[PDB]
Write a protein that binds this ligand. Structure first.
Ligand SMILES: *[C@H](C)[C@H]1/C(=C/c2[nH]c(/C=C3N=C(/C=C4\NC(=O)C(CC)=C4C)C(C)=C\3CCC(=O)O)c(CCC(=O)O)c2C)NC(=O)[C@@H]1C
Ligand SMILES: *[C@H](C)[C@H]1/C(=C/c2[nH]c(/C=C3N=C(/C=C4\NC(=O)C(CC)=C4C)C(C)=C\3CCC(=O)O)c(CCC(=O)O)c2C)NC(=O)[C@@H]1C
Ligand SMILES: *[C@H](C)[C@H]1/C(=C/c2[nH]c(/C=C3N=C(/C=C4\NC(=O)C(CC)=C4C)C(C)=C\3CCC(=O)O)c(CCC(=O)O)c2C)NC(=O)[C@@H]1C
Ligand SMILES: *[C@H](C)[C@H]1/C(=C/c2[nH]c(/C=C3N=C(/C=C4\NC(=O)C(CC)=C4C)C(C)=C\3CCC(=O)O)c(CCC(=O)O)c2C)NC(=O)[C@@H]1C
Ligand SMILES: *[C@H](C)[C@H]1/C(=C/c2[nH]c(/C=C3N=C(/C=C4\NC(=O)C(CC)=C4C)C(C)=C\3CCC(=O)O)c(CCC(=O)O)c2C)NC(=O)[C@@H]1C
Ligand SMILES: *[C@H](C)[C@H]1/C(=C/c2[nH]c(/C=C3N=C(/C=C4\NC(=O)C(CC)=C4C)C(C)=C\3CCC(=O)O)c(CCC(=O)O)c2C)NC(=O)[C@@H]1C
Ligand SMILES: *[C@H](C)[C@H]1/C(=C/c2[nH]c(/C=C3N=C(/C=C4\NC(=O)C(CC)=C4C)C(C)=C\3CCC(=O)O)c(CCC(=O)O)c2C)NC(=O)[C@@H]1C
Ligand SMILES: *[C@H](C)[C@H]1/C(=C/c2[nH]c(/C=C3N=C(/C=C4\NC(=O)C(CC)=C4C)C(C)=C\3CCC(=O)O)c(CCC(=O)O)c2C)NC(=O)[C@@H]1C
Lengths: 161, 647, 160, 67, 161, 160, 161, 160
């Protein structure tokens, strides 16, 4: 994975030049937003199971999926769906703390669309479930850090499609 | 038929071991150049090989005489050679007529084939070809052939080959010992079969005969014993690094944990404990956990620790639940502290890759494990196991008949196909001939030709793509506007049609020196119809260069069908048709066939420019499952937001 | 970065980052202005360090530039000065990142195998970084020097 | 991380059927505390006999500071 | 596609021998049931729109699926679901006439799950709608032929799992 | 929407919007307050129009309400009034958009196949909207009614 | 695709509600900005090639990208990148006129990451070129409408990165 | 502690502590006196923090003290404030240590298995510590409360 610090180092490393003032401003922006990122991560970590709880209730519950014939009928499937949204929330916080969507394109999305197609998991529904996470996360933490969380949750939605 | 395919990569079983094969593979598995030992194996063999040629040359020429003298001694009552294709224990000579012609034909050819395999044994220089093919032969031949008669037949041939050759004691002893091995292996009854017991309820039990694991090159097994000299101790540790990291990383990058190396060299922690600590180390974590998805890192962790791929769907489901609970350490702990690991490797033995030859294989995860045992496995980042296992129970997936790679991305321009080599994501599925793919219509759902074939030439009314037609009169059609009329209004409409006709054949608008000006003005004059104009743009050398030539033949056919008809192919019946034309006639006739097709004529007239009519479900998902464009009522429960009753 | 280190470790155990790891990042983020200042000083006299430390290297170790040496020649001397420019660049990345991970991943893993193949003495390059340590410390305050030298001595320590 | 100095013989039950090579079943090894419960259960299910177990690493009755 | 006849032909052809006594018995068993197969097909042919009508009224109508927010709300989507159930009844008749569910694997369930997941078609509600067809068809045709029809209708349902 | 239509046309030609197309939107944008006036009038008296046009339909066509009809019963008439309430809602979306797209997309395409399946006479639904047009016309200004009639006649024309 | 008018209508249609005060105010806000959007689009239309000209000059030209070894070396690949940015600017104008980024997801960003990866097109270099478009467009058009264009150009960047 | 984990992380790679890692120990030690001040506030008012939040639990969830509940009687209520006293002691260890390591190993590992055996609702104990966080936030300064909040929320978060 790459964080915002490593990303601007690697961009300078590939060119084979020292970090200039324009590249240094990218770091200073991260060191300014770093306090906002750490505080946001602490809130989501505390309400990790709680954010999912509201998100499933808003989007997934009392729909087609949970009813017999759907992809969330059996208790094993339902628990796996909670597990999947527990995955998505945990990795979105990792990417938020890093300040780069490198971990998502490495451990989350790179070979997820193929699995979801094969298992018969509806992508259109799970995207809406992550959008349900996005709304809960932004309401709990704030508008400033929820927008930051929003980008990386949208990144998962884009990779799934 | 099966609904999923794991892949059918080429299997190369070792039928018999030779001296060069035994020498080269010995250092290959150790990842070393052939040292003073393995060179001397070849040196002595290459010198003796010249003599070994003289052994066979005499035995191949006089092959008729050896089998004649054998059969005459064994079989009594006539001549056994009528229909050619020292120590008696207590044999009785078999009658020719009583045994029957069918049994006699078997008996004669086996006697020749025994000698034939002896000649191959000397040439190979290793009696492996004998040991394999003779060990479990006594039992199967007992039923309708006497054992007592066979032993004296080989013993006759032993004397027959001895007297005929008789050159030197350094030469004849090679003939003697290989025959001595032959009779001893034939005297030996069939050994018990290697039983691969299922580690749990999920995995099936298997069996392999004691003959298949006698030739197929035994995997070098290293065990850390506390007393060993540090050179072979280094060889054990290097092999342990070659198992966990797929390669010797301590030689490559000098990446080694000496902290763990010291404890195993002493005997503080076992090899089981070493593998445990090495697979939860940051050195493995960075390389085989960090770059991979939780499912694929699990699949890699299987081949590193257990030395095999996940066997069942339930096994992947179980071990994914472990890696979700506690992560990498918990996964490693589950793999090392399994009933399978301690049965195969125990505590001292280094894990080894158990493939086709090592043990009995199951017909479930064949191609999935074949690609996994390859060194190109940690580049396939798409999971192969959980994908195939889930697809096994499910019906046939939304896929092109010739694989997932044959499907282009549903974009405006550019034929973009998933590469087989770059990021292995090949998903084979057993598609038969009469298999029609379900396609989503761009326009109304009622206007699909599968359910409503009459509504094939119905235009999508603000649901699908814009239809371009030469409805308006072309400029200079009639001699009404005589000479002048500089502001002829019907001129911009036909030019916009031309641009759209270019945009359909070639997704993007072309450059200055790419536009076929001859074809444009013939359409504008009214010499040719749109159908002919589309055909000419697809018959262009530029279309050949840009879409046909750089792409796989059937990929190029599929993309052409998605451009000219605006529709993916339904299945094999259509794809095989155009592929047959592509073989015999060429590219230009494939263009001709797609335009002169009835379905083209029904959908688009002589004046109609083609358009995107049907999408693949995977293609529409890329369009309408993103953050935007997605509606609220696709796969979400909609609650009616009403103002509360207290408000 | 310690951010990357903490996330991957949390990723390994499949758990959210502990507040004992989050406070480490918080202290790292806040104390970043000092690290960027040291890096700016190092990149400011990038040519000055290489020239001075290079001159002192060939003075102390003459066999490097003597006939039969590895850096003996025209382009060979220039490549070693370029190699010093690489390691100084690697140091600046390390100071910025506040970790020895970027130095390791780019140009420290398989250094022993690289210089063995080229036929370059490993301890002389370790000496070359040690000379770069002394020059960089000279053009900086005691607190800034000791912080940067810690990254320098890591490069020396990994080589020799 | 507390480690147990364990001494146990674990005879193979399938060695005859599997036709695998002979391995030294008697071993004196250090095993982590978090793994020992799964380790001990594995040995005694195979019909293996535990000879001697010693707490080599750690202090008996520790509350804080283990790993 | 493969019917009960072509399945026997296929099996004999790959063996590379003429149709034996056991092969003739399998054909005669199909021809004996063939009188009931054509009879059932003709009734379903005549009563095609009525079976769908009764099935939609049983399960789909006056529910959350047909109401706003549902997938069977829009008129183009309603007519799609009618046509979808027009497919299911037609192809079940096809498989009933054939004596094999080969056509269902080739045309009906050939990437149907991925189609329904992409569009956002309810998996649970469609299965219940096919079951609503199954109940109506069995009450309309008979207890023997309707049960025989019900096998292939369950095959579509189990294919959507 | 006419904005949507203009962009789609520009998308197909793969060009920037024509100055004629830009002026078409500009005229629609300025004349958007008039469209929202008609929409609010139809929204404000939605229960009045449906009830008036309902009774007027049932007098003209008694057969649909009489025993044996499609809309016979207190629950079936309620569905018929709901049907018109849907169609009137579709009109309000059309007036706002300034285009006959939203009426077509949601509640015109696959209406013939829908009402045949339910057993509803299609000409009676065409009459119901024609009665809805008449009530709506005599509740707003002449310029407001003529603009609204363009969308109403589109609902009638497609269903007929 | 859907514009700001259609997005409000669809949201009201999904609920099954008439256009309420909140829905009407969302339309009125668009009609207020309608004069700003049309005038902005006409400026971009007139200076279509000019924006792309000064975008490549700022970011791409006289770099390793233009020089041999780079992706935008050959005249074929140069005209390809010019066309790409011509497409990006035009589709940003469409989204600016519509007041929704639905067209960008449907016609541009649908498998654009997978396309650019396969070809070997640098993401960072492309993003910078779209970032160069943003600054050029804002200097040409204005402050408010330049900000409006800047949102959808960031939306292309976010979907590509 | 932060110290013990940094040693573990360094020993896992089999190397000395990083210049960055040593700075994180330095950052912890410098702010060590601040962490002790947080602990001194909590330990000094141990009686008031358990009585206030103890009552707040019973007012929020009365089913605990209701007949049929877990903590019913004079003895069972005395064990509930004893339990909260143990968790308050764990928090003070965690702030001093700088990590949630001592909280985990003593009274957070197998917390689900413990209360499941005793027949105690795990959500109720999660709410009890959540009430302790609210009382601690008011009595202590904003900077100290926010630092201690993360340690409290970890106890609640794992018990949820
Ligand atoms: C009654 C015994 C207790 C109770 C019930 C209760 N359950 C829910 C919510 C759901 N229940 C399930 C579980 C299942 N559905 C299945 O298909 C299966 C497998 C056979 C099971 C076990 C699900 C999925 C839901 C969600 C609803 C849906 O279908 O989408 C609730 C509602 C919770 C809420 O507020 O949302 C309730 C009340 N609760 C009690 O107190 C009883 C002891
Ligand atoms: C919940 C939002 C929706 C849903 C989820 C669902 N997932 C599974 C099973 C699996 N989940 C995955 C996916 C991942 N593997 C990874 O590496 C990652 C990234 C870290 C993830 C998220 C996989 C591979 C599996 C298979 C393991 C298993 O068998 O459990 C299921 C179970 C399906 C089944 O039983 O076959 C479900 C239901 N699907 C829905 O219905 C929700 C909308
Ligand atoms: C310019 C900013 C950078 C760049 C561009 C570049 N693009 C291509 C070729 C293609 N561009 C696309 C992408 C699209 N397809 C779509 O549907 C859309 C949205 C409407 C886009 C933008 C495609 C499909 C291609 C392939 C060929 C074709 O034109 O059809 C190239 C050439 C690549 C080649 O080797 O052929 C280039 C160079 N690359 C840079 O260097 C710039 C930073
Ligand atoms: C035969 C002379 C007498 C005999 C033998 C006997 N031994 C065992 C037990 C084991 N012996 C071994 C084998 C070895 N371990 C090594 O490392 C080596 C050197 C390479 C050898 C030879 C092992 C591993 C076992 C344990 C069982 C296993 O296969 O894993 C038994 C079996 C005891 C039991 O009941 O389990 C036997 C019978 N016993 C006699 O009566 C003979 C006089
Ligand atoms: C409870 C009755 C008393 C008690 C128990 C206690 N045990 C441990 C530690 C372990 N217990 C075992 C033993 C077993 N392994 C087996 O195979 C079996 C037979 C099925 C058992 C019961 C093991 C292996 C452990 C280690 C734990 C692990 O996870 O590996 C402890 C903890 C000791 C410590 O100080 O950490 C305790 C408390 N002690 C009492 O106070 C009770 C009277
Ligand atoms: C009705 C039971 C449920 C339902 C149906 C529904 N389907 C669609 C759209 C499509 N249906 C298909 C499927 C098929 N076409 C085939 O060739 C076959 C195999 C014989 C089938 C079954 C397709 C391809 C489409 C896409 C449009 C097209 O006709 O090409 C919709 C509309 C989805 C949309 O948003 O456009 C609907 C509503 N959904 C329900 O609510 C019912 C439970
Ligand atoms: C009244 C004008 C006429 C009439 C009405 C009638 N309709 C139904 C059934 C349905 N009508 C619809 C149609 C729509 N619902 C929508 O969402 C839209 C688009 C916005 C339309 C136009 C639907 C879907 C139904 C099903 C009802 C349900 O929600 O379940 C009936 C009932 C038919 C029956 O007997 O089951 C009736 C009576 N019929 C007449 O005779 C009038 C001319
Ligand atoms: C001299 C004959 C005429 C002339 C030249 C001129 N060119 C540019 C700008 C560029 N030229 C190219 C073209 C190519 N690069 C390639 O790789 C190839 C294919 C092998 C060609 C032909 C490019 C890409 C540039 C951009 C610069 C760069 O490479 O980074 C200029 C500069 C104009 C400007 O500033 O935009 C000039 C002056 N101009 C004339 O009038 C001469 C007749």
């Amino acid at each position: 994975m790459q964080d915002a610090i490593t990303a601007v180092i690697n961009s300078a490393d590939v060119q084979g030049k020292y970090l200039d003032g324009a590249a240094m401003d990218k770091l200073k922006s991260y060191f300014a937003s770093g306090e906002l990122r750490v505080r946001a991560a602490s809130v989501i970590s505390a309400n990790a199971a709680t954010i999912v709880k509201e998100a499933v209730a808003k989007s997934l519950l009392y729909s087609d999926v949970t009813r017999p014939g759907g992809n969330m009928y059996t208790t094993r499937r339902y628990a796996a769906c909670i597990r999947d949204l527990d995955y998505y929330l945990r990795y979105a916080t990792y990417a938020m703390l890093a300040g780069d969507a490198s971990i998502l394109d490495e451990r989350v999305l790179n070979g997820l669309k193929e699995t979801y197609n094969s298992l018969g998991v509806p992508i259109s529904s799970t995207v809406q479930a992550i959008q349900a996470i996005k709304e809960v996360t932004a309401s709990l933490v704030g508008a400033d850090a929820g927008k930051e969380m929003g980008v990386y949750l949208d990144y998962i939605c884009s990779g799934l499609s | 038929s099966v609904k999923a395919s794991g892949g059918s990569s080429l299997a190369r079983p070792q039928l018999y071991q030779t001296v060069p094969v035994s020498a080269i593979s010995q250092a290959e598995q150790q990842d070393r150049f052939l040292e003073g030992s393995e060179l001397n194996e070849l040196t002595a063999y290459f010198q003796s090989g010249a003599l070994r040629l003289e052994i066979a040359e005499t035995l191949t020429q006089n092959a008729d005489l050896i089998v004649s003298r054998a059969a005459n001694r064994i079989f009594t009552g006539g001549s056994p050679l009528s229909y050619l294709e020292p120590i008696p224990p207590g044999f009785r000579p078999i009658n020719i007529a009583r045994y029957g012609p069918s049994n006699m034909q078997k008996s004669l050819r086996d006697m020749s084939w025994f000698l034939r395999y002896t000649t191959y044994a000397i040439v190979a220089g290793d009696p492996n070809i004998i040991v394999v093919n003779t060990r479990g032969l006594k039992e199967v031949i007992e039923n309708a052939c006497s054992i007592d008669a066979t032993i004296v037949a080989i013993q006759e041939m032993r004397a027959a080959s001895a007297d005929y050759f008789r050159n030197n004691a350094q030469a004849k002893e090679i003939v003697l010992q290989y025959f001595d091995i032959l009779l001893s292996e034939f005297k030996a009854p069939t050994p018990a079969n290697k039983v691969r017991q299922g580690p749990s309820n999920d995995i099936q039990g298997l069996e392999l005969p004691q003959s298949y694991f006698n030739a197929a090159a035994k995997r070098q097994k290293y065990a850390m014993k506390p007393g060993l000299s540090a050179l072979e101790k280094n060889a054990v540790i290097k092999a342990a690094y070659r198992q966990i990291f797929e390669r010797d990383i301590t030689k490559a990058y000098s990446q080694s944990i000496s902290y763990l190396e010291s404890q195993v060299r002493n005997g503080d922690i076992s090899m089981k404990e070493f593998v445990r600590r090495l697979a939860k180390s940051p050195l493995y974590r960075k390389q085989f956990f960090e770059p991979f998805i939780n499912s694929r890192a699990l699949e890699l962790a299987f081949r590193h620790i257990l030395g095999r791929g996940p066997s069942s769907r339930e096994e992947v489901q179980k071990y994914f639940s472990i890696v979700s609970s506690g992560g990498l350490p918990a996964l490693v702990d589950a793999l090392v502290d399994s009933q399978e690991y301690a049965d195969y490797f125990g505590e001292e033995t280094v894990p080894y890759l158990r493939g086709l030859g090592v043990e009995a294989q199951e017909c479930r995860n064949w191609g999935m494990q074949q690609d996994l045992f390859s060194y190109s496995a940690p580049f396939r980042k798409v999971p192969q196991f959980i994908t195939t296992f889930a697809q096994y129970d499910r019906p046939l997936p939304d896929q092109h008949v010739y694989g997932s790679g044959n499907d282009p991305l549903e974009i405006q321009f550019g034929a973009i196909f998933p590469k087989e080599t770059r990021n292995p994501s090949k998903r084979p599925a057993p598609f038969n001939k009469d298999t029609k793919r379900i396609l989503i219509h761009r326009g109304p759902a009622v206007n699909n030709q599968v359910g409503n074939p009459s509504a094939v030439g119905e235009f999508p009314g603000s649901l699908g793509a814009k239809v371009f037609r030469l409805n308006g009169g072309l400029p200079g059609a009639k001699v009404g506007k005589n000479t002048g009329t500089s502001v002829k209004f019907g001129e911009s409409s036909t030019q916009a049609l031309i641009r759209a006709a270019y945009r359909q054949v070639f997704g993007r608008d072309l450059y200055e020196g790419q536009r076929l000006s001859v074809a444009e003005i013939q359409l504008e004059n009214g010499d040719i119809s749109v159908r002919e104009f589309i055909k000419r743009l697809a018959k262009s050398e530029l279309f050949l260069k840009l879409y046909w030539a750089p792409h796989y033949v059937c990929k190029a056919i599929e993309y052409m069908h998605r451009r000219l008809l605006g529709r993916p192919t339904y299945g094999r019946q259509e794809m095989n048709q155009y592929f047959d034309i592509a073989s015999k006639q060429g590219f230009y006739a494939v263009v001709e066939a797609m335009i002169d097709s009835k379905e083209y004529s029904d959908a688009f007239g002589e004046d109609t420019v083609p358009y995107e009519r049907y999408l693949t479900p995977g293609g529409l998902q890329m369009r309408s499952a993103r953050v935007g464009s997605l509606r609220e009522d696709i796969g979400q429960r909609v609650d009616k937001e009403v103002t509360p009753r207290f408000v | 970065s310690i951010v990357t280190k903490s996330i991957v470790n949390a990723d390994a155990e499949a758990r959210y980052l502990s507040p004992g790891e989050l406070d480490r990042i918080k202290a790292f983020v806040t104390g970043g202005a000092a690290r960027l200042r040291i890096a700016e000083t190092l990149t400011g006299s990038r040519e000055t360090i290489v020239k001075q430390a290079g001159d002192r290297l060939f003075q102390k170790r003459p066999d490097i530039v003597s006939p039969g040496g590895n850096a003996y020649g025209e382009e060979m001397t220039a490549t070693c000065l370029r190699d010093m420019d690489y390691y100084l660049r690697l140091v600046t990345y390390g100071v910025v990142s506040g970790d020895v991970t970027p130095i390791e991943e780019i140009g420290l893993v398989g250094v022993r195998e690289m210089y063995r193949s080229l036929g370059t003495p490993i301890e002389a390059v370790a000496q070359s970084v040690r000379e770069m340590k002394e020059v960089a410390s000279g053009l900086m305050s005691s607190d800034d020097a000791a912080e940067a030298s810690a990254y320098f001595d890591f490069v020396i320590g990994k080589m020799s | 991380m507390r480690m147990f100095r364990i001494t146990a013989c674990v005879p193979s039950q399938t060695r005859i059927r599997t036709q695998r090579e002979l391995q030294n079943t008697y071993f004196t090894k250090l095993v982590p505390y978090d793994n020992w419960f799964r380790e001990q259960q594995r040995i005694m299910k195979m019909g293996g006999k535990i000879v001697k177990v010693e707490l080599a690493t750690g202090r008996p009755g520790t509350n804080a500071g283990l790993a």
